């Protein structure tokens, strides 16, 4: 439930929430670098937008309460196990 959104529409989506949906989309744990790639290209914007948001993504992702850091920075959802 994250692809049907438009560019500006995705822009105003909460960054950790985008990632949450990204994980239910993939159903696979995804490394930190790769999940950002997935997000940025899903949006009709440059990655650099989400670059400001990369820094803040460290902050926001580490204060979330549903995420899971699996192996080295492979994120996902603990709601699978």
From Swiss-Prot:
Organism: Bacillus subtilis (strain 168)
Oligomeric form and interacting partners: RNAP is composed of a core of 2 alpha, a beta and a beta' subunit. The core is associated with a delta subunit, and at least one of epsilon or omega. When a sigma factor is associated with the core the holoenzyme is formed, which can initiate transcription.
Protein name (database record): DNA-directed RNA polymerase subunit delta
Protein family according to the UniProt entry: Belongs to the RpoE family.
Covered range of the whole protein: 2 to 82 of 173
Domain HTH HARE-type, chain residue ranges per copy: 13-80
Reported phenotype of the disruption mutant: No visible phenotype; grows as well as wild-type at 25-49 degrees Celsius, no apparent impairment in sporulation or phage SP01 growth.
Function summary: Participates in both the initiation and recycling phases of transcription. In the presence of the delta subunit, RNAP displays an increased specificity of transcription, a decreased affinity for nucleic acids, and an increased efficiency of RNA synthesis because of enhanced recycling. May function in sigma factor switching. It displaces RNA bound to RNA polymerase in a binary complex.
